[PDB]
Ligand SMILES: C=C(C)[C@H]1CN[C@H](C(=O)O)[C@H]1CC(=O)O
Ligand SMILES: C=C(C)[C@H]1CN[C@H](C(=O)O)[C@H]1CC(=O)O
Ligand SMILES: [Cl-]
Ligand SMILES: [Cl-]
Ligand SMILES: [Cl-]
Ligand SMILES: [Cl-]
Ligand SMILES: [K+]
């Protein structure tokens with residue numbers, strides 16, 4: 001039987017294709033994650049229907065300890081796989097089963113070019129430049145949970161003033177960086193995509209942590225280990241590298 | 255609840271401690287993997303008995319598909335865990351389980367500073383500078399199996415002349431780079447360790463792939479998922495980073 005794949009629109013992972021007529025079904029979508037799913041299908045031999053997660057969230061826990069987003073779809077067995085830039089984290093791995101990573105990344109800083117700011121510590125030791133993250137994403141959670149002094153200082157700042165420094169989504173964060181004196185704490189692979197397309201933006205510093213994106217499955221799924229082996233095949237043959245090059249390349253920035 | 259741990263001597267992961275008297279048991283060893291095992295045992299609450307793998311190998315298949323090394327120890331249920339710089343690969347994932355990675359790396363090139371060589375394609379297009387890898391290791395297997403034209407070229411060269419360009423172990427490769435006109439294809443984390451200590455050597459180019467080290471267990475082990483959760487905890491608290499800095503940092507280079 002056909003697997004249900006939960007996902008979420010996020011450039012360049014999953015995007016609506018451009019067409020002069022209304023689109024239906026899997027034909028609605030293109031992107032790195034659709035290519036990955038096509039290759040995982042080619043290897044494992046399953047059919048699949050792609051379904052956008054109905055609440056438009058990745059997966060976080062609230063105050064009752066209730067999950068939402070793609071994580072919840074898997075928990076409830078309303079999806080077989082989640083194929084998205086879903087960060088592999090301690091809290092999520094307790095509740096679902098991720099494949100080994102198809103991409104490796106870290107938190108870093110998106111800001112304007114031409115400034116003297118060079119690191120997270122440069123941000124933390126000042127208050128003039130505002131900085132934040134996407135509310136309730138894994139980057140925000142990293143800062144909330146950190147016991148490293150610099151990151152504690154940064155969390156105090158972000159969470160201050162009813163979290164006015166946080167943004168609802170990455171596009172809001174990018175526009176805030178482009179318009180105002182603001183730096184966004186963002187996953188490095190998204191920074192790479194953005195800076196290839198807006199030439200006034202740059203990554204500040206290196207990666208402050210290390211983590212991966214993996215395919216999510218419900219706990220106990222037999223697909224998890226089969227997908228890990230397929231991912232390793234695609235990596236070792238250079239296919240993942242080719243797919244990243246295809247979707248990230250921008251041709252307009254120095 | 256004492257787990258049997260198979261491992262292998264490899265700087266700075268597992269080393270003999272220095273003492274004026276003979277050492278016994280787990281007290282024989284120190285290094286990043288011993289620190290990791292201490293942290294995992296604190297989180298998960300197990301005792302452990304460390305045993306060097308009797309044949310002194312990581313794990314590779316022969317012609318008949320038979321395995322050796324730490325991988326074979328796990329297959330035969332002679333150990334509960336393998337804790338070492340054991341690269342997570344397609345062929346090993348078919349026969350053992352691994353935790354998610356505690357370190358992420360790629361193949362790169364170890365060579366001398368101040369030469370014209372900038373990339374693997376610089377090596378592939380010539381025959382004057384010899385280059386190779388540790389025989390039967392994951393790096394050699396990467397080249398053997400690659401269909402990328404550059405890496406096929408490189409494999410043809412490495413395997414020529416009864417594999418004269420290959421070496422038996424990393425220390426042999428390091429001495430050959432120091433003495434002769436030779437470049438070693440080596441996992442990037444080992445290159446970092448080496449170049450901290452040999453100021454006339456450098457990494458050439460970037461990473462030509464992406465992979466991790468994981469804790470190995472027999473297929474079906476319940477510890478694999480528990481160890482993954484412990485590793486993510488250690489990563490997110492910044493402990494893995496601190497552990498790397500502790501074992502890697504050298505005395506500085508002029
Ligand atoms: C696009 C966003 C909301 C997602 C992508 N990965 C992270 C996640 O899976 O939580 C989030 C980004 C972040 O928190 O920087
Ligand atoms: C130290 C060596 C022989 C090991 C370490 N990881 C690789 C493995 O697990 O196969 C080998 C290195 C390599 O192949 O470059
Ligand atoms: Cl069309
Ligand atoms: Cl849908
Ligand atoms: Cl021993
Ligand atoms: Cl896993
Ligand atoms: K249209």
Ligand SMILES: [K+]
Pocket residue numbers: 093094095096097098219479
């Ligand atoms: K899990």
Ligand SMILES: [K+]
Pocket residue numbers: 225347348349350351352473
């Ligand atoms: K496996």
